[PDB]
Ligand binder design. Structure first.
Ligand SMILES: COc1ccc(-n2nnc3cnc(N[C@H]4CC[C@H](N)CC4)nc32)cc1
Length: 293
């Protein structure tokens, strides 16, 4: 199908019917077109918040955005329409799919982590937080082995529909304080992704916010007395008695994985965000310093 005098052969990616894979006749290449329907004055607020971010970011490990189109298919010069299309680079697959067929080799999991931390270093330098890091939002170009961070729909600079969001990659601070978003929150998610790349399975797979904390507390130790006293006053009684009970450490959740990868992960998956490595700190670590020239 057609969309304006540039994009031809629109084919979906499904059951959604809002994401397409068309070809640009002016460039003679494949592109991924995403549609955003506008009704709610908050849906316009989220669309405006996203466009400003995606048009400002240009990095080798970030999904490059080509154009922002209107309902007819004409480009936007930069509102109050009905539908807005977004043209992005087209990527082969996404890490969610890659993990579906099983764990990556320690050489591929390390390479993708380096590219994820390089991409995170760029967005955090521009004071932008991804706010939704998960394997589905990390796109893979299998032949060049290139990871590219995409889907900045939840991204913010510096509460509704919480059911449709995955809590599996949320930090303990984010589960206690959902209103505050920091650079450290993106780092915990990056750690959870690296552990999923090595094992194939989700490290902390919780149904809700409370169950997510219960699973994190079983493996991640609370070192600071400030965080420990806060938990005794916030997390419920059934989770409170469970943390003093014996459980599996992080090294037992990663069987067959080398101590170099586990000790690097133990520095990122810290309960307190103060002890946590940043994107710059993680890239300068001996486990990641080997990829830079
Ligand atoms: C929730 O719905 C979505 C899903 C994907 C995207 N985005 N956003 N940018 C993208 C660049 N490339 C691709 N390619 C697909 C091709 C098929 C593969 N199995 C998976 C990757 N998809 C993109 C946006 C919204």
């Amino acid at each position: 199908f057609d969309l304006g005098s540039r994009y031809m052969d629109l084919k979906p990616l499904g059951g959604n019917g809002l994401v397409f894979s068309a070809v640009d006749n002016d460039c003679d290449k494949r592109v991924a077109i995403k549609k955003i329907v506008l009704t709610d004055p908050q849906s316009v607020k989220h669309a405006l918040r996203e466009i400003k971010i995606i048009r400002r970011l240009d990095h080798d490990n970030i999904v490059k955005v080509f154009e922002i189109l209107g309902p007819s298919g004409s480009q936007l010069t930069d509102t109050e329409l009905n539908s807005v299309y977004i043209v992005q680079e087209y990527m082969e697959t996404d890490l969610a799919n890659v993990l579906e067929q099983g764990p990556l080799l320690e050489e591929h999991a390390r390479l993708f982590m380096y590219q994820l931390l390089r991409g995170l270093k760029y967005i955090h330098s521009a004071n932008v937080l991804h706010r939704d890091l998960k394997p589905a939002n990390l796109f893979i170009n299998t032949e060049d082995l290139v990871l590219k961070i995409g889907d900045f729909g939840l991204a913010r600079i510096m509460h509704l529909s919480e059911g449709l969001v995955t809590k599996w990659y949320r930090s303990p601070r984010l589960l206690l304080s959902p209103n505050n978003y920091t650079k450290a929150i993106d780092m915990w998610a990056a750690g959870c992704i690296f552990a999923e790349m090595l094992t194939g399975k989700t490290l902390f797979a919780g149904a809700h916010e409370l169950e997510q904390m219960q699973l994190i507390l079983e493996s991640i130790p609370v070192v600071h007395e400030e965080d420990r006293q806060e938990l005794l006053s916030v997390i419920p009684v059934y989770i409170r008695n469970d943390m003093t009970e014996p459980h599996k450490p992080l090294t037992q959740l990663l069987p067959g994985i080398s101590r170099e990868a586990v000790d690097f992960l133990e520095q990122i998956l810290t309960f307190s965000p103060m002890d946590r490595l940043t994107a710059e700190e993680a890239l300068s670590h001996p486990y990641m310093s080997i990829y830079s020239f």
